[PDB]
């Protein structure tokens, strides 16, 4: 039995929330604040920041698991599959202040439940690696000074 015998949790189990990374190793988070507004308890706080290339990312990401109800509304709200509820249930603590997780306690080293999705390969905003016209279903920029009619 527990804890000697582990418990099978189904792949969709709504437990510890983690931030994930894209197949390229970059954080999938773009700091759009959709998961936070969609959150019914208001236990998510983050601030947008931008790399010199122009990539948006969370300067800070805070989740108060003392208030979290593990509903998965935030994971259902990402347009980037960064925030994901993972099959984990052991998060007991001694002080409530330690139930406030930061990006250091949330950003893992892999893609998580969604294995191959990069919003930056769909976005039209240019970043280091993807220039204008290099996204999916995207034509190359045509200059207004082009000679072709």
């Amino acid at each position: 039995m527990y804890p000697e015998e582990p418990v099978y949790l189904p792949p969709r189990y709504r437990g510890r929330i983690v931030l994930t990374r894209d197949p390229d190793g970059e954080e999938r988070c773009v700091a759009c604040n959709l998961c936070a507004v969609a959150c019914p308890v208001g236990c998510i706080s983050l601030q947008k920041a931008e790399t010199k290339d122009g990539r948006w990312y969370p300067e800070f990401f805070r989740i108060n698991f003392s208030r979290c109800i593990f509903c998965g509304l935030c994971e259902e709200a990402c347009p980037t599959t960064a925030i994901q509820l993972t099959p984990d249930f052991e998060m007991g603590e001694y002080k409530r202040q330690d139930l406030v997780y930061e990006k250091e306690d949330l950003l893992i080293s892999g893609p998580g439940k969604y294995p191959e999705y990069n919003f930056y390969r769909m976005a039209g905003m240019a970043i280091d690696g993807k220039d204008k016209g290099e996204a999916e279903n995207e034509a190359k920029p045509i200059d207004v000074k082009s000679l072709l009619p």
Partner: protein
């Protein structure tokens, strides 16, 4: 290991101190053996009093699969929302318990009010009752309570409570244990791939 001294709730003496036993002036191998024996008996004999509130009590009874009197209980598990009309009752039951006593907050509601930041709910039992272990969840899985009990056992095995109420220092020295979040940060961050949410 640093300790927090609660000499003689929201406001009370909480001086960070050093292991009182390690201090040479009050260092006795016999006294240390005695402290360990008492801590061992207490951590291996935690009789519980489950105050049933809201939906968390239902998960608790699944884990159960009784000190009906608060007097015979060593641990009060607050499992449910701390409603305004229920708060006086919770305080009275906890105040009808004897030393040593421990409190485990089970559920987002008991932890901080959870999704119920409303006019009829106290935002956390830690607003009126001292808590030792917090269990995040809504409802927390039955197995999560078992982890919390094991965490309490560890904290109890490190306490330095008075060995007798007539002699010695009557101060409750609780160890400043390492946060479980930092303790298991390495394994959690190392996680790379997970099962796709497509299969049972």
């Amino acid at each position: 290991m640093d300790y927090t001294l609660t000499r003689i709730y929201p406001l009370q003496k909480q001086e960070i101190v050093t292991d009182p036993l390690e201090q040479e002036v009050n260092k006795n191998v016999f006294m240390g053996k005695l402290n360990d024996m008492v801590n061992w008996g207490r951590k291996n004999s935690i009789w519980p009093y489950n105050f049933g509130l809201s939906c968390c009590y239902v998960e608790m009874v699944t884990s159960f699969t009784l000190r009906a009197s608060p007097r015979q209980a060593d641990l009060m598990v607050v499992a449910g929302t701390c409603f305004t009309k229920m708060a006086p009752v919770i305080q009275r039951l906890y105040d009808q318990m004897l030393e040593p006593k421990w409190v485990i907050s089970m559920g987002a509601c008991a932890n901080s009010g959870g999704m119920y930041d409303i006019y009829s709910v106290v935002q956390g039992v830690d607003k009126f009752i001292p808590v030792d272990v917090y269990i995040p969840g809504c409802p927390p899985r039955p197995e999560a309570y078992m982890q919390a009990l094991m965490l309490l056992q560890e904290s109890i095995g490190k306490e330095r409570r008075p060995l007798s109420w007539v002699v010695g220092d009557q101060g409750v020295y609780r160890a400043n244990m390492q946060s479980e979040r930092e303790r298991k940060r390495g394994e959690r961050i190392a996680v790379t791939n997970l099962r796709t949410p497509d299969e049972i």
